[PDB]
């Protein structure tokens, strides 16, 4: 399932409007990428499927602070 494991992003549907305004249902997929994040506290890498934006949330809050919420929600990796 295409879900960012730190934010909660997911494929939200939309409309692919043409020039002549033809509404055809489409789908906006998040830019997810499986990445290994080195946790120093556990002195171990943690592979996580996160979004590109989610990476920037990690660079701001701190990997450990982020993982605090994951075990808080049970987003088991």
């Amino acid at each position: 399932s295409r879900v960012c494991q730190v934010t909660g992003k997911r494929p939200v549907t939309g409309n692919n409007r043409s020039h002549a305004l033809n509404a055809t249902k489409r789908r906006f997929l998040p830019n997810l990428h499986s990445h290994r994040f080195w946790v120093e506290s556990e002195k171990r890498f943690v592979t996580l499927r996160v979004s590109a934006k989610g990476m920037r949330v990690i660079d701001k809050k701190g990997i450990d602070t982020v993982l605090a919420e994951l075990r808080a929600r049970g987003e088991k990796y």
Binding site: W38, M55, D59, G62
Partner: protein, 53 residues
């Protein structure tokens, strides 16, 4: 991103120089190998006297 040095590493290291390197370079090479310190508010304060002077 904003990162503060921990080691020597050339062209961008002098043990304590805050450099704005590229994200990938910091998060996948400098941080995991301890070559640098995640420059967050407290770490900026943790350097100035503890390991700077």
């Amino acid at each position: 991103m904003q990162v503060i040095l921990l080691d020597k590493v050339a062209n961008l290291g002098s043990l304590g120089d805050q450099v704005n390197v590229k994200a990938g370079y910091a998060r996948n090479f400098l941080v995991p190998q301890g070559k640098a310190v995640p420059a967050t508010k407290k770490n900026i304060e943790f350097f100035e006297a503890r390991r700077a002077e």
